[PDB]
Amino acid sequence: PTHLSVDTKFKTEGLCVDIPGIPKDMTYRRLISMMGFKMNYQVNGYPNMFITREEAIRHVRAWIGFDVEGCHGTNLPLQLGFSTGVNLVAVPTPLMYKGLPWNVVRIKIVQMLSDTLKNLSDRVVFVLWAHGFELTSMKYFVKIGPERTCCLCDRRATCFSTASDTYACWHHSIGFDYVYNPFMIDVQQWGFTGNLQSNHDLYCQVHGNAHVASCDAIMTRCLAVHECFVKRVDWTIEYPIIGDELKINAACRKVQHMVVKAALLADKFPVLHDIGNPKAIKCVPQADVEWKFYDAQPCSDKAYKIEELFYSYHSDKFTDGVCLFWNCNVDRYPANSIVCRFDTRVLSNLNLPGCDGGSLYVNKHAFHTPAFDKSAFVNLKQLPFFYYSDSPCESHGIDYVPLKSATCITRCNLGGAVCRHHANEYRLYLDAYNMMISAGFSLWVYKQFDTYNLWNTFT
Numbered sequence: 282p283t284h285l286s287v288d289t290k291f292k293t294e295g296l297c298v299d300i301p302g303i304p305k306d307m308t309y310r311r312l313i314s315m316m317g318f319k320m321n322y323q324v325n326g327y328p329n330m331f332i333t334r335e336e337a338i339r340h341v342r343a344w345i346g347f348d349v350e351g352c353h354g355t356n357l358p359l360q361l362g363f364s365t366g367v368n369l370v371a372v373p374t375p376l377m378y379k380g381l382p383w384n385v386v387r388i389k390i391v392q393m394l395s396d397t398l399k400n401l402s403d404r405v406v407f408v409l410w411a412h413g414f415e416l417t418s419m420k421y422f423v424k425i426g427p428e429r430t431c432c433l434c435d436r437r438a439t440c441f442s443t444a445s446d447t448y449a450c451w452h453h454s455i456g457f458d459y460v461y462n463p464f465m466i467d468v469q470q471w472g473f474t475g476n477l478q479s480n481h482d483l484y485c486q487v488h489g490n491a492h493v494a495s496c497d498a499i500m501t502r503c504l505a506v507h508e509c510f511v512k513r514v515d516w517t518i519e520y521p522i523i524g525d526e527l528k529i530n531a532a533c534r535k536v537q538h539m540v541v542k543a544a545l546l547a548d549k550f551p552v553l554h555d556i557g558n559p560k561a562i563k564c565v566p567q568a569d570v571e572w573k574f575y576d577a578q579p580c581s582d583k584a585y586k587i588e589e590l591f592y593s594y595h596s597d598k599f600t601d602g603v604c605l606f607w608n609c610n611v612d613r614y615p616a617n618s619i620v621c622r623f624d625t626r627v628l629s630n631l632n633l634p635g636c637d638g639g640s641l642y643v644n645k646h647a648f649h650t651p652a653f654d655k656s657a658f659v660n661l662k663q664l665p666f667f668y669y670s671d672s673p674c675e676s677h678g679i680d681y682v683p684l685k686s687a688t689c690i691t692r693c694n695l696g697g698a699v700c701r702h703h704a705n706e707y708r709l710y711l712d713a714y715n716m717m718i719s720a721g722f723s724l725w726v727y728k729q730f731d732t733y734n735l736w737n738t739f740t
């Protein structure tokens with residue numbers, strides 16, 4: 282059992298207002314046929330247009346909410362809405378486009394999906410709250426058949442062109458008119474009571490209902506993300522490398538070691554309370570400090586309340602020394618903290634839109650993160666960039682321009698002239714730092730933190 286059997290039953294109650302008389306007894310095999318598609322007993326990689334919840338979770342980067350609302354059915358214009366915010370009007374003859382025939386609408390759909398998905402996934406998964414019109418509109422822009430490869434590269438084909446009779450992936454589909462072998466899932470099959478809005482609004486207040494198809498498309502995908510990444514969590518699912526994952530993760534480790542080491546050297550805290558990932562390792566193994574760990578898994582719904590993490594009777598005295606919250610999202614950090622907090626508003630191919638202001642950050646594993654909130658940092662200040670090193674000044678073993686910087690905290694810079702080794706290491710660190718910030722991470726520190734206290738750690 283890897284794919285969804287076409288012989289699986291499909292509940293049709295949600296479809297009977299657009300499709301009156303629809304049989305209660307229905308399989309995906311009969312539904313696909315009713316949608317105007319012929320599967321021809323083909324064992325060529327595409328067993329079903331519909332996929333399981335587990336297959337959908339593995340392809341969350343491909344998710345595109347899709348809704349169709351009757352503007353006035355083959356006789357009336359249809360409003361096609363996508364979770365990208367696009368509304369297209371198709372005539373049978375928050376962006377809102379005027380009514381156009383299907384032969385031009387389908388070209389826009391291919392362009393939109395290709396621009397949205399080329400850097401995210403090798404496919405598309407239409408996320409539906411199926412009522413009928415969305416399923417019966419698919420024949421006007423979708424073509425199915427055996428799994429194919431792109432005409433210009435090795436990637437799987439996602440588009441088809443009637444002008445050239447060729448197939449393309451999302452990167453090579455300019456001018457293509459059909460979506461080829463898309464996938465889809467109907468959220469209504471998961472067992473819900475009530476309409477889309479009532480279920481969506483239970484968990485999210487950030488997506489309103491402006492009564493347009495793209496609003497329903499957005500709410501549908503948001504509800505699906507809530508069910509699959511908020512109420513249910515699975516950190517055993519791996520996701521392919523699509524960007525700077527490895528550089529970002531390595532940069533995160535370098536910056537954490539740098540910041541914690543310098544905070545310990547500058548303020549000499551006798552104890553450090555490391556709150557977060559139960560599999561955390563000491564980021565500064567040589568530090569003298571008493572290192573105490575507290576287990577908290579990544580919160581995917583609401584940020585942890587500091588009163589629940591710290592209180593109910595451990596060192597007990599979290600007020601002693603410093604608290605390290607490295608990606609441990611809390612409502613309000615104590616004043617004696619070192620914090621790394623992911624900013625959910627960041628635009629990147631790793632960061633997908635999420636539920637109730639939160640975002641779905643996908644880097645090796647999927648992590649739904651509660652909405653970024655500036656008020657969590659009221660007791661702290663932004664951590665300024667700096668590079669600190671106590672290593673000997675020695676080159677060992679890429680051409681040079683001498684480094685001049687007030688933030689290169691080294692013996693050579695104290696002495697008046699940055700050495701080649703510390704200049705190379707400073708530039709590498711600055712690159713790793715900028716990589717982590719641009720990925721969406723934000724750094725915060727206790728107000729007394731001052732890099733001026735680091736200069737006397739070389740004597």
Ligand SMILES: C[C@@]1(NC(=O)C2CC2)CCS(=O)(=O)C1
Binds near residue numbers: 317426
């Ligand atoms: C003829 C069919 N396809 C087309 O319309 C091609 C794009 C022109 C109908 C739906 S199918 O089952 O994919 C075969």
Ligand SMILES: [Zn+2]
Binds near residue numbers: 434450451452
């Ligand atoms: Zn290609």
Ligand SMILES: [Zn+2]
Binds near residue numbers: 486500503504637
């Ligand atoms: Zn929502």
Ligand SMILES: [Zn+2]
Binds near residue numbers: 675694699701702
């Ligand atoms: Zn040096």
